[PDB]
From a paper:
Our random mutagenesis approach has yielded four new crystal structures of glutaredoxin A, one for each of the following variants: R27L, A75I, A79S, and P84R.
Neither is involved in crystal packing interactions nor core packing interactions, and therefore, these positions are predicted to be highly tolerant of modification. Since ammonium sulfate is used in the crystallization medium of these glutaredoxin A crystals, there are two sulfate anions coordinated to the wild-type and to the mutated glutaredoxin A structures. Interestingly, the A75I mutation does not coordinate sulfate ions in its crystal structure. As there is no sulfate anion bound to the N-terminus, the His-tag of A75I is considerably more disordered that the other glutaredoxin structures that do coordinate sulfate. While the elevated temperature factors can be explained by the lack of sulfate coordination, the rationale for the lack of this anion in this mutation is still unknown.
Author numbering: -10 to 88
Amino acid sequence: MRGSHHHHHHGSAVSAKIEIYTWSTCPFCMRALALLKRKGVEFQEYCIDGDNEAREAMAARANGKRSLPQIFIDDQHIGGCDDIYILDGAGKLDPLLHS
């Protein structure tokens, strides 16, 4: 297959799984989104506007928390908008996304 291929035993190529639960018009959710979008990372947004079930699903994963947003990286619970910004401020976010 013609091209410049990288070898290092990746086998099956997968990248970090990045997830965010949101309300579309939540100013905190929007701030969190801006941040990831700024990084250029690939992520999945679970926009649960008016969805009671999904909030419950969320809470199950988010340590009982129903506040928004809720962020996850490689199935690790990161937390809310606050949390991710603190991580970025400390130089800790990029190693997770990761680089």
